[PDB]
Amino acid sequence: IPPLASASGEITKNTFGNIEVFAPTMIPGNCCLVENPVAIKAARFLGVEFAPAVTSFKFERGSTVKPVLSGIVVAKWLREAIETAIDGSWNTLLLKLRIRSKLNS
Amino acid sequence: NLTVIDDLWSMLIRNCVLSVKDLQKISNLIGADQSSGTIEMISCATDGKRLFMTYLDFGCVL
DNA sequence: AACACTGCGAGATA
DNA sequence: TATCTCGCAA
Ligand SMILES: [Ca+2]
Ligand SMILES: [Ca+2]
Protein backbone atom coordinates (compact mmCIF):
# COMPACT_ATOMS: atom_id res chain seq x y z
CA ILE A 1 0.00 0.00 0.00
CA PRO A 2 1.58 3.28 -1.13
CA PRO A 3 1.24 6.43 1.00
CA LEU A 4 -1.68 8.72 0.26
CA ALA A 5 -1.47 12.01 -1.58
CA SER A 6 -1.58 15.15 0.51
CA ALA A 7 -4.56 17.50 0.70
CA SER A 8 -3.11 19.58 -2.14
CA GLY A 9 -2.76 16.32 -4.09
CA GLU A 10 1.02 15.92 -3.80
CA ILE A 11 2.28 12.42 -4.48
CA THR A 12 5.31 10.92 -2.77
CA LYS A 13 7.75 9.64 -5.37
CA ASN A 14 10.89 7.52 -5.58
CA THR A 15 14.50 8.65 -5.96
CA PHE A 16 14.12 9.36 -9.70
CA GLY A 17 11.10 11.63 -9.10
CA ASN A 18 8.64 9.09 -10.51
CA ILE A 19 6.05 6.78 -9.00
CA GLU A 20 6.39 3.11 -9.91
CA VAL A 21 2.99 1.66 -10.80
CA PHE A 22 3.23 -1.97 -11.93
CA ALA A 23 -0.11 -3.04 -10.38
CA PRO A 24 -3.46 -1.30 -9.68
CA THR A 25 -2.64 -1.88 -5.99
CA MET A 26 0.31 0.51 -6.45
CA ILE A 27 -1.93 3.52 -7.16
CA PRO A 28 -2.54 5.52 -3.95
CA GLY A 29 -6.07 5.12 -2.63
CA ASN A 30 -6.93 8.81 -3.11
CA CYS A 31 -5.21 8.97 -6.52
CA CYS A 32 -5.76 7.82 -10.09
CA LEU A 33 -3.54 6.78 -12.98
CA VAL A 34 -4.00 8.64 -16.27
CA GLU A 35 -2.17 6.96 -19.16
CA ASN A 36 -1.63 9.23 -22.16
CA PRO A 37 1.30 10.41 -24.33
CA VAL A 38 0.55 14.00 -23.24
CA ALA A 39 -0.69 13.47 -19.68
CA ILE A 40 2.64 14.83 -18.45
CA LYS A 41 2.59 17.92 -20.65
CA ALA A 42 -0.95 18.47 -19.39
CA ALA A 43 -0.23 18.13 -15.67
CA ARG A 44 2.80 20.41 -16.09
CA PHE A 45 0.66 22.90 -17.99
CA LEU A 46 -1.96 23.03 -15.22
CA GLY A 47 0.88 23.44 -12.72
CA VAL A 48 -0.97 20.95 -10.51
CA GLU A 49 0.64 18.30 -8.29
CA PHE A 50 1.35 14.98 -10.01
CA ALA A 51 3.94 12.26 -10.39
CA PRO A 52 5.12 10.61 -13.62
CA ALA A 53 4.14 6.95 -13.69
CA VAL A 54 6.71 4.27 -14.50
CA THR A 55 4.44 1.45 -15.67
CA SER A 56 7.05 -0.94 -17.11
CA PHE A 57 10.59 -1.22 -18.47
CA LYS A 58 11.58 -1.06 -22.13
CA PHE A 59 14.51 -3.34 -22.95
CA GLU A 60 16.52 -1.88 -25.81
CA ARG A 61 19.78 -2.14 -27.75
CA GLY A 62 23.38 -1.79 -26.58
CA SER A 63 23.13 -2.97 -22.97
CA THR A 64 20.63 -0.72 -21.21
CA VAL A 65 17.11 -0.96 -19.78
CA LYS A 66 14.86 2.12 -19.95
CA PRO A 67 11.79 3.07 -17.88
CA VAL A 68 8.49 3.47 -19.74
CA LEU A 69 6.84 6.63 -18.40
CA SER A 70 3.38 5.97 -19.83
CA GLY A 71 1.62 8.75 -17.90
CA ILE A 72 0.75 10.47 -14.63
CA VAL A 73 -0.58 9.75 -11.15
CA VAL A 74 -2.65 12.63 -9.78
CA ALA A 75 -5.14 12.93 -6.97
CA LYS A 76 -8.66 11.74 -7.78
CA TRP A 77 -10.31 15.18 -7.56
CA LEU A 78 -8.07 16.44 -10.37
CA ARG A 79 -8.88 13.63 -12.82
CA GLU A 80 -11.36 15.61 -14.91
CA ALA A 81 -9.13 18.69 -14.86
CA ILE A 82 -6.35 16.51 -16.26
CA GLU A 83 -8.76 14.87 -18.72
CA THR A 84 -9.77 18.35 -19.93
CA ALA A 85 -6.12 19.29 -20.22
CA ILE A 86 -5.34 16.17 -22.20
CA ASP A 87 -8.78 16.24 -23.95
CA GLY A 88 -8.95 19.86 -25.10
CA SER A 89 -17.39 22.05 -26.20
CA TRP A 90 -17.28 25.84 -26.15
CA ASN A 91 -17.93 26.03 -22.40
CA THR A 92 -15.28 23.40 -21.65
CA LEU A 93 -12.68 25.14 -23.83
CA LEU A 94 -13.51 28.54 -22.31
CA LEU A 95 -13.52 27.30 -18.70
CA LYS A 96 -10.14 25.63 -19.22
CA LEU A 97 -8.88 28.96 -20.56
CA ARG A 98 -10.31 30.71 -17.51
CA ILE A 99 -8.59 28.24 -15.26
CA ARG A 100 -5.30 28.39 -17.12
CA SER A 101 -5.25 32.10 -16.48
CA LYS A 102 -6.40 32.20 -12.90
CA LEU A 103 -3.55 29.68 -12.40
CA ASN A 104 -0.61 31.13 -14.33
CA SER A 105 -0.75 34.52 -12.63
CA ASN B 1 -19.57 41.79 -15.43
CA LEU B 2 -19.06 42.93 -19.02
CA THR B 3 -15.35 43.32 -18.30
CA VAL B 4 -15.18 39.71 -17.12
CA ILE B 5 -17.07 38.45 -20.15
CA ASP B 6 -14.89 40.40 -22.60
CA ASP B 7 -11.83 39.03 -20.78
CA LEU B 8 -13.14 35.54 -21.24
CA TRP B 9 -13.86 36.46 -24.85
CA SER B 10 -10.55 38.32 -25.09
CA MET B 11 -8.38 35.37 -24.08
CA LEU B 12 -6.90 34.67 -27.52
CA ILE B 13 -4.28 36.28 -29.74
CA ARG B 14 -5.87 38.90 -32.00
CA ASN B 15 -8.51 41.11 -30.36
CA CYS B 16 -10.25 42.09 -33.61
CA VAL B 17 -13.98 37.90 -34.04
CA LEU B 18 -13.02 34.36 -33.00
CA SER B 19 -11.65 32.72 -36.14
CA VAL B 20 -11.60 29.02 -37.01
CA LYS B 21 -7.80 29.15 -36.66
CA ASP B 22 -8.13 30.79 -33.24
CA LEU B 23 -10.60 28.24 -31.97
CA GLN B 24 -8.34 25.58 -33.43
CA LYS B 25 -5.37 27.07 -31.58
CA ILE B 26 -7.20 26.95 -28.29
CA SER B 27 -8.64 23.52 -28.80
CA ASN B 28 -5.33 22.18 -29.97
CA LEU B 29 -3.47 23.60 -26.96
CA ILE B 30 -5.83 22.42 -24.25
CA GLY B 31 -5.17 18.84 -25.63
CA ALA B 32 -7.99 18.34 -28.18
CA ASP B 33 -7.55 15.90 -30.96
CA GLN B 34 -10.21 17.65 -33.04
CA SER B 35 -10.42 17.35 -36.79
CA SER B 36 -10.34 20.49 -38.91
CA GLY B 37 -13.94 19.54 -39.63
CA THR B 38 -14.71 19.28 -35.92
CA ILE B 39 -15.69 22.92 -35.47
CA GLU B 40 -19.05 21.90 -34.03
CA MET B 41 -19.27 24.35 -31.13
CA ILE B 42 -17.72 27.27 -33.01
CA SER B 43 -19.44 26.23 -36.25
CA CYS B 44 -22.86 26.19 -34.60
CA ALA B 45 -21.96 29.34 -32.66
CA THR B 46 -22.05 31.37 -35.91
CA ASP B 47 -25.39 33.21 -35.70
CA GLY B 48 -25.00 35.67 -38.58
CA LYS B 49 -23.13 33.17 -40.81
CA ARG B 50 -19.90 35.09 -41.42
CA LEU B 51 -17.83 31.93 -40.60
CA PHE B 52 -16.66 33.40 -37.30
CA MET B 53 -17.89 34.06 -33.74
CA THR B 54 -18.31 37.66 -32.56
CA TYR B 55 -18.75 38.83 -28.96
CA LEU B 56 -22.57 38.62 -28.95
CA ASP B 57 -22.45 35.09 -30.33
CA PHE B 58 -19.81 34.10 -27.80
CA GLY B 59 -22.03 35.48 -25.04
CA CYS B 60 -24.98 33.44 -26.34
CA VAL B 61 -22.90 30.26 -26.44
CA LEU B 62 -21.97 30.71 -22.79
C1' DA C 1 14.03 -4.09 -14.72
C1' DA C 2 16.18 3.75 -14.54
C1' DC C 3 20.86 8.76 -14.89
C1' DA C 4 20.44 12.70 -16.12
C1' DC C 5 19.84 17.37 -20.40
C1' DT C 6 21.26 20.28 -22.24
C1' DG C 7 26.64 23.21 -22.59
C1' DC C 8 30.36 24.16 -25.94
C1' DG C 9 33.34 24.92 -29.26
C1' DA C 10 33.94 24.42 -34.71
C1' DG C 11 32.77 27.91 -38.98
C1' DA C 12 31.29 31.98 -40.23
C1' DT C 13 29.44 37.48 -40.10
C1' DA C 14 27.38 41.99 -40.98
C1' DT D 1 34.12 41.89 -34.05
C1' DA D 2 29.06 40.10 -32.65
C1' DT D 3 25.76 36.10 -34.46
C1' DC D 4 23.88 32.34 -35.71
C1' DT D 5 23.72 27.47 -36.81
C1' DC D 6 24.81 23.07 -35.63
C1' DG D 7 27.21 19.03 -34.69
C1' DC D 8 28.39 17.07 -30.58
C1' DA D 9 28.52 14.47 -25.99
C1' DA D 10 26.05 11.53 -23.26
CA1 LIG E 1 -9.51 36.57 -34.00
CA1 LIG F 1 -20.85 35.30 -36.76
Q: How does DSSP assign A30-42, residue by residue?
A: TEEEEE-TTHHHH
The three-class DSSP label of residue B29 is helix
B34 DSSP assignment:
-
Interface test with A, best of B30, B46, B52, B53 (most A CBs within 10 A): B30
- Residues in chain A within 8 Å Cβ distance of B26: 93, 97
Among B49, B21, A100, smallest CA distance to B57 is for B49
Among A38, A37, A45, A54, smallest CA distance to A97 is for A45
Q: What is the resolution of this structure in A?
A: 8.2
A49 class by beta-carbon count within 10 Å (0-12 exposed, 13-18 middle, 19+ buried): middle
* Strands A31-35 vs A50-59: parallel, antiparallel or unpaired: unpaired
Say how far apart CA B34 and CA A88 lie, in whole Å: 8
| Helix (H) or strand (E) run with residue A19 in it | strand A19-20
Q: Do B23 and A93 touch (CB under 8 A)?
A: yes
φ and ψ at residue A55, rounded to 5 degrees? -95, -15
φ and ψ at residue B46, rounded to 5 degrees? -70, 95
Q: Do A89 and B31 touch (CB under 8 A)?
A: no
Closest residue to C3 measured CA to C1′: A16
